[PDB]
PDB file of all heavy atoms in Angstrom:
ATOM      1  N   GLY T   2      -9.603 -13.776  -9.344  1.00 30.32           N
ATOM      2  CA  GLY T   2     -10.963 -13.593  -9.799  1.00 30.32           C
ATOM      3  C   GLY T   2     -11.161 -12.140 -10.311  1.00 30.32           C
ATOM      4  O   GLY T   2     -10.346 -11.235 -10.018  1.00 30.32           O
ATOM      5  N   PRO T   3     -12.208 -11.843 -11.152  1.00 30.90           N
ATOM      6  CA  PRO T   3     -12.436 -10.461 -11.608  1.00 30.90           C
ATOM      7  C   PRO T   3     -12.970  -9.628 -10.443  1.00 30.90           C
ATOM      8  O   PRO T   3     -13.585 -10.209  -9.497  1.00 30.90           O
ATOM      9  CB  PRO T   3     -13.447 -10.674 -12.726  1.00 30.90           C
ATOM     10  CG  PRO T   3     -14.238 -11.918 -12.267  1.00 30.90           C
ATOM     11  CD  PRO T   3     -13.213 -12.803 -11.618  1.00 30.90           C
ATOM     12  N   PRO T   6     -18.995  -6.688  -8.364  1.00 28.00           N
ATOM     13  CA  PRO T   6     -19.897  -5.685  -8.951  1.00 28.00           C
ATOM     14  C   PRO T   6     -19.766  -4.350  -8.194  1.00 28.00           C
ATOM     15  O   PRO T   6     -19.524  -4.366  -6.972  1.00 28.00           O
ATOM     16  CB  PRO T   6     -21.274  -6.283  -8.754  1.00 28.00           C
ATOM     17  CG  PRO T   6     -21.120  -7.124  -7.531  1.00 28.00           C
ATOM     18  CD  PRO T   6     -19.723  -7.718  -7.623  1.00 28.00           C
ATOM     19  N   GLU T   9     -23.878  -0.605  -4.387  1.00 30.91           N
ATOM     20  CA  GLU T   9     -25.213   0.120  -4.416  1.00 30.91           C
ATOM     21  C   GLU T   9     -25.039   1.646  -4.314  1.00 30.91           C
ATOM     22  O   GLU T   9     -24.152   2.099  -3.623  1.00 30.91           O
ATOM     23  CB  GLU T   9     -26.081  -0.295  -3.247  1.00 30.91           C
ATOM     24  CG  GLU T   9     -26.670  -1.658  -3.363  1.00 30.91           C
ATOM     25  CD  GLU T   9     -27.683  -1.950  -2.315  1.00 30.91           C
ATOM     26  OE1 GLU T   9     -27.900  -1.092  -1.412  1.00 30.91           O
ATOM     27  OE2 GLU T   9     -28.351  -3.058  -2.327  1.00 30.91           O
ATOM     28  N   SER T  12     -27.714   6.210  -0.017  1.00 32.37           N
ATOM     29  CA  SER T  12     -29.078   6.658   0.391  1.00 32.37           C
ATOM     30  C   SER T  12     -29.233   8.116  -0.066  1.00 32.37           C
ATOM     31  O   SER T  12     -28.276   8.897   0.048  1.00 32.37           O
ATOM     32  CB  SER T  12     -29.295   6.513   1.823  1.00 32.37           C
ATOM     33  OG  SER T  12     -29.200   5.146   2.270  1.00 32.37           O
ATOM     34  N   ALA T  15     -31.690  13.561   3.200  1.00 31.05           N
ATOM     35  CA  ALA T  15     -32.917  14.105   3.749  1.00 31.05           C
ATOM     36  C   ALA T  15     -33.221  15.466   3.162  1.00 31.05           C
ATOM     37  O   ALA T  15     -32.338  16.189   2.718  1.00 31.05           O
ATOM     38  CB  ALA T  15     -32.869  14.260   5.257  1.00 31.05           C
ATOM     39  N   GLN T  16     -34.518  15.769   3.096  1.00 32.83           N
ATOM     40  CA  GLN T  16     -34.958  17.122   2.795  1.00 32.83           C
ATOM     41  C   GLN T  16     -34.384  18.151   3.779  1.00 32.83           C
ATOM     42  O   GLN T  16     -34.215  17.831   4.995  1.00 32.83           O
ATOM     43  CB  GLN T  16     -36.464  17.133   2.730  1.00 32.83           C
ATOM     44  CG  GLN T  16     -37.070  18.543   2.303  1.00 32.83           C
ATOM     45  CD  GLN T  16     -38.488  18.495   1.998  1.00 32.83           C
ATOM     46  OE1 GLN T  16     -39.134  17.543   2.451  1.00 32.83           O
ATOM     47  NE2 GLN T  16     -39.033  19.547   1.355  1.00 32.83           N
ATOM     48  N   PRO T  18     -34.279  21.646   6.183  1.00 31.85           N
ATOM     49  CA  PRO T  18     -35.233  22.137   7.177  1.00 31.85           C
ATOM     50  C   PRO T  18     -36.247  23.140   6.540  1.00 31.85           C
ATOM     51  O   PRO T  18     -35.945  23.782   5.556  1.00 31.85           O
ATOM     52  CB  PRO T  18     -34.317  22.867   8.175  1.00 31.85           C
ATOM     53  CG  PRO T  18     -32.935  22.610   7.779  1.00 31.85           C
ATOM     54  CD  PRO T  18     -32.937  22.053   6.457  1.00 31.85           C
ATOM     55  N   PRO T  21     -37.329  30.013   7.317  1.00 32.50           N
ATOM     56  CA  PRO T  21     -37.689  30.906   8.350  1.00 32.50           C
ATOM     57  C   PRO T  21     -39.108  31.376   8.202  1.00 32.50           C
ATOM     58  O   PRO T  21     -39.665  31.496   7.084  1.00 32.50           O
ATOM     59  CB  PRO T  21     -36.713  32.036   8.253  1.00 32.50           C
ATOM     60  CG  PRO T  21     -35.699  31.579   7.317  1.00 32.50           C
ATOM     61  CD  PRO T  21     -36.259  30.556   6.425  1.00 32.50           C
ATOM     62  N   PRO T  24     -41.855  37.591   6.834  1.00 28.36           N
ATOM     63  CA  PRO T  24     -41.849  38.948   7.431  1.00 28.36           C
ATOM     64  C   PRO T  24     -43.211  39.331   7.872  1.00 28.36           C
ATOM     65  O   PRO T  24     -44.198  38.780   7.457  1.00 28.36           O
ATOM     66  CB  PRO T  24     -41.355  39.816   6.254  1.00 28.36           C
ATOM     67  CG  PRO T  24     -41.098  38.984   5.028  1.00 28.36           C
ATOM     68  CD  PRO T  24     -41.541  37.583   5.393  1.00 28.36           C
TER      69      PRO T  24
ATOM     70  N   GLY I   3      -9.989 -17.056 -10.259  1.00 25.41           N
ATOM     71  CA  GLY I   3     -10.925 -17.375  -9.197  1.00 25.41           C
ATOM     72  C   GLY I   3     -12.346 -16.739  -9.489  1.00 25.41           C
ATOM     73  O   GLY I   3     -12.544 -16.122 -10.518  1.00 25.41           O
ATOM     74  N   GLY I   6     -15.171 -11.019  -7.309  1.00 25.89           N
ATOM     75  CA  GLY I   6     -14.995 -10.493  -5.969  1.00 25.89           C
ATOM     76  C   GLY I   6     -16.354 -10.125  -5.328  1.00 25.89           C
ATOM     77  O   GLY I   6     -17.384 -10.203  -5.940  1.00 25.89           O
ATOM     78  N   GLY I   9     -19.076  -4.160  -4.152  1.00 24.88           N
ATOM     79  CA  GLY I   9     -18.451  -2.965  -3.612  1.00 24.88           C
ATOM     80  C   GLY I   9     -19.276  -2.397  -2.461  1.00 24.88           C
ATOM     81  O   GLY I   9     -20.433  -2.817  -2.334  1.00 24.88           O
ATOM     82  N   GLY I  12     -22.503   3.380  -1.587  1.00 24.13           N
ATOM     83  CA  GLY I  12     -22.020   4.724  -1.738  1.00 24.13           C
ATOM     84  C   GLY I  12     -22.386   5.543  -0.517  1.00 24.13           C
ATOM     85  O   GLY I  12     -23.213   5.145   0.302  1.00 24.13           O
ATOM     86  N   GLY I  15     -26.400  10.917   0.355  1.00 26.76           N
ATOM     87  CA  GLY I  15     -26.410  12.247  -0.150  1.00 26.76           C
ATOM     88  C   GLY I  15     -26.450  13.248   1.013  1.00 26.76           C
ATOM     89  O   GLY I  15     -26.904  12.967   2.102  1.00 26.76           O
ATOM     90  N   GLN I  17     -27.873  16.433   3.104  1.00 27.37           N
ATOM     91  CA  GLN I  17     -29.217  17.048   3.340  1.00 27.37           C
ATOM     92  C   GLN I  17     -29.372  18.220   2.408  1.00 27.37           C
ATOM     93  O   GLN I  17     -28.472  18.920   2.074  1.00 27.37           O
ATOM     94  CB  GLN I  17     -29.291  17.429   4.783  1.00 27.37           C
ATOM     95  CG  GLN I  17     -30.678  17.968   5.178  1.00 27.37           C
ATOM     96  CD  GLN I  17     -30.912  18.304   6.658  1.00 27.37           C
ATOM     97  OE1 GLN I  17     -29.978  18.592   7.389  1.00 27.37           O
ATOM     98  NE2 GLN I  17     -32.195  18.352   6.993  1.00 27.37           N
ATOM     99  N   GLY I  18     -30.615  18.448   1.938  1.00 27.21           N
ATOM    100  CA  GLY I  18     -31.020  19.582   1.195  1.00 27.21           C
ATOM    101  C   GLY I  18     -30.818  20.823   2.031  1.00 27.21           C
ATOM    102  O   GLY I  18     -30.684  20.851   3.216  1.00 27.21           O
ATOM    103  N   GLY I  21     -35.332  25.651   3.440  1.00 27.87           N
ATOM    104  CA  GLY I  21     -36.338  26.211   2.541  1.00 27.87           C
ATOM    105  C   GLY I  21     -36.369  27.729   2.534  1.00 27.87           C
ATOM    106  O   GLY I  21     -35.633  28.388   3.350  1.00 27.87           O
ATOM    107  N   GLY I  24     -40.907  32.222   4.600  1.00 33.12           N
ATOM    108  CA  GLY I  24     -42.368  32.180   4.305  1.00 33.12           C
ATOM    109  C   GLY I  24     -42.772  33.510   3.749  1.00 33.12           C
ATOM    110  O   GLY I  24     -42.126  34.573   3.686  1.00 33.12           O
ATOM    111  N   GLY I  27     -46.944  38.243   6.373  1.00 31.52           N
ATOM    112  CA  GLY I  27     -48.192  38.327   7.065  1.00 31.52           C
ATOM    113  C   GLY I  27     -49.234  39.176   6.339  1.00 31.52           C
ATOM    114  O   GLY I  27     -50.456  39.156   6.648  1.00 31.52           O
TER     115      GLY I  27
END
Side-chain angles (χ1 to χ4, degrees):
Chain T
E9 286 189 355
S12 297
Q16 183 168 20
Chain I
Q17 183 175 27

